[PDB]
Design a binder for this molecule. Structure first.
Ligand SMILES: *[C@@H]1O[C@H](CO)[C@@H](O)[C@H](O)[C@H]1NC(C)=O
Ligand SMILES: COc1cc(/C=C/C(=O)O)ccc1O
Ligand SMILES: COc1cc(/C=C/C(=O)O)ccc1O
Length: 261
């Protein structure tokens, strides 16, 4: 289906996670007041940047990754070789985008130790992972690993590439209850004709998982669509090309601009 309209509560949640993702490009400018900032995640070889955060009000530990912000990150973006996802031996025949797998391995020990430290102290909190574009694929690989280790794992992505093959997409669909929009814990958000959700091309053995939430302009709850099933539809049907204007700006927030309250 491609169903018009979402609730005000869900729209507010998508805008909150988009704000965190776009603020990750400018040292977390103007993130919600309900959030305590924890340790920085960083690797010098890959230039992967992220943070661990905590929202006591909503009882969640949030991990965010920045998208592309350097020449080194652009090199990762264009390594389209599929690589076995050996992080999860139980993910049968799962393969991931080769550049993003290097990025994930380069920060894995930091992410896992910092998440363990928070989860051990707040064992009833949910774990949420988010990011934009390259940061969205970093979030997907991270959330897959956490889902095998913890309860109540959630994933909000914005302008996400195809992160791996169909086996990886179906593992995520099962682990995140994607079979209904009423149960999903994986919200794969897209905007208008963003070109990045069309890369790598599906013909190279790549696939998306999750429920797609497609924001059409002008943006609002009533002009966001819920997209499920195998038909080409929503953002992917628009056939946008590459890094374009729609890619940069989600719910009126441009990466790193700090124009939000
Ligand atoms: C692409 O990434 C994979 C790991 O996921 C790596 O083994 C391979 O050598 C990379 N390709 C290049 C050209 O660096
Ligand atoms: C998956 O393919 C690509 C992804 C990006 C990501 C851009 C960003 O994080 O801004 C750029 C070029 C690509 O070919
Ligand atoms: C030009 O102004 C508008 C256009 C739309 C169109 C919605 C769509 O076709 O999906 C919605 C609200 C507006 O204020």
């Amino acid at each position: 289906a491609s169903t018009q309209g979402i609730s005000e509560d869900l729209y507010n949640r998508l805008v909150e996670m988009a704000t965190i993702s776009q603020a990750a490009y400018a040292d977390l400018c103007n993130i919600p007041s309900t959030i305590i900032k924890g340790e920085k995640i960083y690797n010098a070889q890959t230039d992967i940047n992220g943070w661990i955060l905590r929202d006591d009000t909503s009882k969640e530990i949030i991990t965010v990754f920045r998208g592309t912000g350097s020449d080194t990150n652009l090199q990762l973006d264009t390594n389209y070789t599929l690589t076995p996802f050996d992080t999860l031996p139980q993910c049968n025949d799962c393969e991931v985008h080769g550049g993003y797998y290097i990025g994930w391995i380069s920060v894995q020990d930091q992410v896992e130790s910092l998440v363990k430290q928070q989860a051990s102290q707040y064992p009833d909190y949910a774990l949420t992972v988010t990011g934009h574009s390259l940061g969205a694929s970093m979030a997907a690989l991270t959330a897959a690993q956490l889902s095998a280790t913890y309860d109540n794992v959630r994933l909000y992505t914005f302008g996400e590439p195809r992160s791996g093959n169909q086996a990886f997409a179906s593992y995520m669909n099962d682990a995140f209850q994607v079979s209904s929009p009423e149960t999903t814990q994986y919200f794969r958000v897209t905007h208008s004709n963003d070109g990045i959700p069309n890369l790598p091309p599906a013909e190279q053995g790549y696939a998306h998982g999750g429920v797609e939430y497609w924001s059409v302009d002008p943006y609002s709850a009533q002009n966001t669509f819920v997209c499920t099933g195998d038909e080409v539809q929503c953002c992917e049907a628009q056939g946008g090309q590459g890094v374009n204007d729609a890619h940069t700006t989600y719910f009126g927030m441009t990466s790193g601009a700090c124009t939000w309250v």
